[PDB]
């Protein structure tokens with residue numbers, strides 16, 4: 348029951364994580380759902396903000412999360428409290444720093460064998476019951492506000508990382524042997540969407556294909572991500588490898604589309 | 618007062634507790650953990666010690682890096698923020714012991730594995746008491 352959060356630093360990777368956990372913890376008006384202190388058995392921790400300040404993640408953090416899907420509800424919102432009547436899953440945030448990206452990808456590349464268990468309190472290479480760490484979905488989070496910048500380093504280095512990310516899963520598909528293939532649907536999420544410069548999802552989809560595809564050409568001259576023979580690279584080519592690739596927007600902070608669209612994507616995939 | 622911002626952030630990035638007196642660029646601390654903990658060119662775990670570095674360009678320019686504490690078991694880091702080589706040694710006295718209070722009060726909570734949520738809300742009261750004793 349694991350969904351991997353992936354992306355470069357500043358993407359709001361660690362902060363999106365924070366948003367989903369504190370959702371049920373505060374009512375609309377950002378009230379602490381639990382400031383009636385001194386309820387031993389059940390009282391949820393008080394939270395001061397729906398998302399907290401963060402600095403760059405230096406480690407994967409795996410976090411407890413429950414998706415509600417009251418029937419006809421789709422996945423219900425992440426801000427509804429539950430007490431069970433839910434699919435349960437692990438959202439694992441990951442580091443974005445190029446040095447720390449590598450370990451995560453090793454997980455992506457080996458299919459079933461590794462599975463996806465991180466030895467917490469560190470990286471590799473306290474409540475116990477039959478729990479599992481299955482990998483059914485991966486999320487790639489980018490900054491669609493920073494993507495706008497003419498410096499264009501961001502799209503290039505960002506798309507490059509995505510290239511490997513998508514490439515590894517592609518290698519994972521060719522690792523169905525370890526006879527039990529699983530389809531890994533990928534969400535490309537364009538974050539930082541309350542900002543006015545935030546590049547629209549359709550464009551992020553379009554730019555990425557262009558950047559990714561060129562990288563293959565760039566790398567090919569130097570595997571072929573996507574189609575064996577592509578006039579141009581589309582996300583749709585990735586389907587061949589059982590990879591549902593989706594570009595969806597949202598914002599962790601401020602006014603905008605919200606994170607529910609992402610959240611609705613996640614629940615539909617566990 | 619008037620020595621900027623104090624932050625208490627986990628190894629994985631979440632900020633358990635923050636006190637900000639001056640607006641501080643996020644990247645300042647962000648640059649800090651990048652070199653101290655991720656690239657690691659000139660740091661050794663300790664209390665009240667060296668607190669110096671310059672990051673190079675894997676991830677940006679960086680200043681030179683406050684004074685700080687690390688709790689490996691809990692994975693929380695304590696940053697008190699200088700003003701570019703302005704100072705008064707109290708933060709040293711402040712920052713290490715101030716982990717000792719924070720650890721004392723909330724050390725139990727890191728044991729829970731599922732969540733990044735440590736509720737330390739009453740802390741600010743203690744913090745003020747401490748700040749005064751160094752004046």
Ligand SMILES: Nc1nc2c(ncn2[C@@H]2O[C@H](COP(=O)(O)OP(=O)(O)OP(=O)(O)O)[C@@H](O)[C@H]2O)c(=O)[nH]1
Pocket residue numbers: 354355356357358359360361362363399400401402403404405441442443444538539540541542597598599600601630643
């Ligand atoms: N305005 C705005 N800020 C955001 C949004 N999403 C994330 N942020 C901010 O971006 C800042 C940096 O993002 P982080 O989540 O802390 O860093 P990260 O995404 O974990 O990436 P790493 O550095 O690899 O750990 C945080 O201070 C967030 O508050 C957003 O949608 N809108």
Ligand SMILES: [Mg+2]
Pocket residue numbers: 360361362401402403404405629630631
């Ligand atoms: Mg982070």
